[PDB]
Symmetry: C2
Amino acid sequence: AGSAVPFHGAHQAGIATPVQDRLHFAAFDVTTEDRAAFVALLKEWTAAARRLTAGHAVGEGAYGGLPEAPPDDTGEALGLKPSRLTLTIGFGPSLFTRFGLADLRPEALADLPKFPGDNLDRARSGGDLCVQACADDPQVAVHAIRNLARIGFGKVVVRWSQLGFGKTSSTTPDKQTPRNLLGFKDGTRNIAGTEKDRLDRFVWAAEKDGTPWMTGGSYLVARRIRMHIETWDRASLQEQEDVFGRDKGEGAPVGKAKERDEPFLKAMKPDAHVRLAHPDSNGGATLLRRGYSFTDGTDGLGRLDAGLFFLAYQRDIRTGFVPVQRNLATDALNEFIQHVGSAVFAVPPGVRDADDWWGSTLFGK
Amino acid sequence: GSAVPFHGAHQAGIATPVQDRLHFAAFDVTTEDRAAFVALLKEWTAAARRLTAGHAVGEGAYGGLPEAPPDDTGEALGLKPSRLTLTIGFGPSLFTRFGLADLRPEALADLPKFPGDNLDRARSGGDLCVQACADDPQVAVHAIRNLARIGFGKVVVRWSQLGFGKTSSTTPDKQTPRNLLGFKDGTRNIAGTEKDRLDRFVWAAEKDGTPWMTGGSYLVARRIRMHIETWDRASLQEQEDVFGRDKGEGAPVGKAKERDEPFLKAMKPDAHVRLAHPDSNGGATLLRRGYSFTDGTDGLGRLDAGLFFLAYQRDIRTGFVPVQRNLATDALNEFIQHVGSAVFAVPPGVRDADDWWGSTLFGK
Ligand code: HEM
Ligand code: HEM
């Protein structure tokens, strides 16, 4: 409908929120050594985010100013609706080496171990901070990231960015589950925005967890995963279904007639993705997945290049992504994918009201 | 609307309404066997019929023999036709194969080198193209991916470009879209409703000199990067002076409304609109059908974004060429760079359920 998603709250939007059709994800590095200047930026960014998420232009607007001045807003979202835009900020481990923050780095913001099979591009990994922009309109998402980058010129730079052309995740099990580029429904067994108890248990950090400023935030893992499309497209229908443990057309667990019927894991192959990723196979570890598909032109060698930009939110990286990904070491899916970029971020609690600002719990004041 | 008819005197995706998203692929041929290529064209035509109606190619994406790879890769299951159009074109380089050298249309002219060109050959050219336009990007991607799969062994993908325009579920269809410079883009263009203009400026006629192309058109593609960060540092007046229109309303200098006809004399001499207008080009007029693109961040931290420019015309020598030549002194040149280029002869339409892409070139 193009409606707005509320920006303020106990949590940042863009996590439990219904998954929007498009993604523009940007990782930034910090260039200023001046803590007071960074705080000033965080406040200016928050003010811009309030405008952008309501479908308004930043600052004084896109036109009507002094002819000799550059417009405050770049203008390409004029005439567009809010489009369910959310903007979610996160702080990477590397941020805590700056501004005297070292003693505030959360233990739950754990560096990932190395995993077998990966080929991580360092230039498109890491980052001192991130902004996840999600919207139903790609032009609204690009506009938001572009204007935040411009406001930040001189104090932060974009390290890397990723566009997602379509979602591969669901926080709304009452709606149709999207399909990834392997042709399978993706998001069936996730966490719903309406599952407040499971979000509290698996997603939101608590004060007793050890880092008071993170109370009401979450921890994000991003993995850019290339898909070996040519090899997958040669596989038989049975081979593809065996890889996942679900049938392709309906997406039901093996032996079942309906997508949402609960899996009987023992009937899956022992290396099936669902069998290895399920919480019951991981001592209860559960993720909020929120990823998107991507294309990246060609491989320069006659083939389309595409994949999945995987995003997982959890209350503690040590009890979420890390154990699950370790259990995927024998995943049959590994034959068809390769992880090629990675980053982790501590996503702070929400912007409480119009006087609050991104990062206020961490920076004080 | 939900779907666009695939059959016609013309191929759809030219004069038909502009869809929200693009997946454009250029292919190169990897077979020397003309009969095998004709067999592929027929197979691709059969697939396009299915795809443009929201159906899976071949026997489908599941339900077949378990030991067989499915005929369709499945990522459009549960989606809609989404106004998908699939438009095929033949590049100059195709005509060196299959004995077609004497059938290359004279109106399929190689573009000259233009001032400021910085073309990436890897993202230029192509023996063939398929333009997939749809409202849902996944429908467009699925079509391209499956056509490439069907063709693998006889064609490969040379380059691939995704693009976007308006989001029609939330943006009114009459509203002109804005490009990534923040200006309305498309105000003075040929419309699919202007049947006589299409005959004058877009469709090839038999007497033009290439009978098999009658009812086709010629396509120019230019991948045009914008220097986003420098543009955003320009003053409002500088930006408006570059185009000859105001930014907010998109009206010409000295007018009040977007669609008021321009008074070219009131624009700066090197304004884009003043140089591009048909009155500045001996009447030359284009059907522009391009899409914005954003491919991420370059190695310098700058937005890799711009316009994937597409123009259809009755003859490349009388459409794109004179107009682009007239843009040599464009004030816009400071903020843009042409980085990829290709031309294609887009054949006439698939006439009925027994016809096939390229039947007039290869013969029935
Ligand atoms: C290209 C890479 C991947 C693809 C194509 C993929 C695909 C799928 C599909 C088709 C399903 C079944 C439907 C669903 O319930 O969502 C699924 C489930 C799941 N995936 Fe993945 N996945 C990928 C990577 C990962 C990674 C990296 C992780 C975690 C480290 C992960 C964790 C999970 C979990 C936890 C489930 C739900 C299992 C359950 O509780 O039933 N997946 N995935
Ligand atoms: C990034 C590159 C470009 C941008 C941002 C751009 C933008 C614009 C804008 C804002 C307008 C005015 C609104 C309209 O009538 O559509 C316009 C008009 C036009 N442009 Fe472009 N343009 C670009 C490249 C080109 C190229 C490469 C050509 C042809 C070689 C071209 C040909 C035209 C024509 C024919 C018009 C209509 C002029 C008239 O008849 O009033 N443009 N363009």
